[PDB]
Write a protein that binds this ligand. Structure first.
Ligand SMILES: Nc1nc2[nH]ccc2c2ccccc12
Length: 274
């Protein structure tokens, strides 16, 4: 299942970096033999010592499975000192860019986005993967198309579950928390937790102290607010799972509203982000 290469540059031409890490980089790559473009995660095997066999095991499982809302693992190359995960390149744009660019945006749009995330994350959970890093930057649109699906582009402070911050043992529930936070931002354009002093901010998250403040939340449905409250629940045992969230009427039913909330959400995204 793994292809072997003396040197990865015999296969690909590496252009821009798409993403970095202490010991991992995702690069835009052209397959020299075909012209086709991919996102290639470059991993030093030295960074895997003590886990190489087990990581390779897991990658071998995931290579055979494509989820609609997760970038596909197209191929694995192994060179003498590196592993290369050849991934589907996504061209559709970043999540917030499209929302600010759209001229029309409703709760039903936000609900459609979260439903996709729930589906992807449920699958990852079944496979034994806790993402731990779900945030808007890891969500990319497949195409520039109007009807484009959203995709998780990559998997292994303000988005992290209280039980983590409290240095406590944690589970797949941490992802359901993050999804709640993303849904919060999708409905108002600002993060639910933020402060100057990290001591304030850490405590706000620990205590799950947030509000649906006016005027931003005034035209948002009770159903959406309830949805978010069930995911941004301090107690991971009471917190909705992905499966429970996907059954909530705001997702599964018809309670998501049809009101154009673009003007306020986009103004807040512009003002709250770089
Ligand atoms: N356009 C992109 N496609 C990608 N497919 C898999 C990862 C990834 C990626 C990672 C960082 C930045 C951009 C992209």
């Amino acid at each position: 299942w793994k292809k072997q290469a003396e040197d990865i540059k015999k296969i690909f031409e590496f252009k821009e970096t798409l993403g970095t890490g202490a010991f991992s980089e995702v690069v835009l790559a052209e397959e020299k033999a075909t012209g086709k473009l991919f996102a290639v995660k470059c991993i030093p095997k030295k960074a895997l010592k003590g886990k190489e066999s087990s990581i390779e095991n897991e990658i071998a499982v995931l290579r055979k499975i494509k989820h609609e809302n997760i970038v596909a693992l197209e191929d694995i190359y192994e060179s003498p000192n590196h592993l290369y995960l050849v991934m589907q390149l996504v061209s559709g744009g970043e999540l917030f860019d499209r929302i600010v660019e759209k001229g029309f945006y409703t709760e039903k749009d936000a609900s459609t986005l979260i439903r996709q995330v729930l589906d992807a994350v449920y699958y990852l959970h079944r496979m034994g993967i806790v993402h731990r890093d779900l945030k808007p930057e890891n969500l990319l649109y497949y195409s520039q198309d109007e009807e484009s699906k959203i995709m998780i582009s990559d998997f292994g402070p303000g988005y992290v579950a209280p039980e983590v911050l409290a240095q406590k043992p944690y589970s797949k529930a941490v992802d359901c928390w993050s999804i709640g936070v993303i849904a919060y931002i999708l409905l108002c354009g600002y993060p639910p937790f933020y402060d100057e002093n990290d001591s304030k901010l850490f405590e706000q998250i620990l205590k799950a102290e947030y509000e649906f403040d006016s005027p931003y939340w005034d035209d948002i449905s009770d159903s959406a607010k309830d949805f978010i409250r069930n995911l941004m629940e301090k107690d991971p045992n009471k917190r909705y799972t992905c499966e429970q969230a996907a059954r909530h009427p705001w997702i599964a039913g018809d309670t998501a509203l049809n009101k154009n909330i673009h003007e306020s959400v986009s103004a807040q995204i512009r003002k709250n982000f770089a």
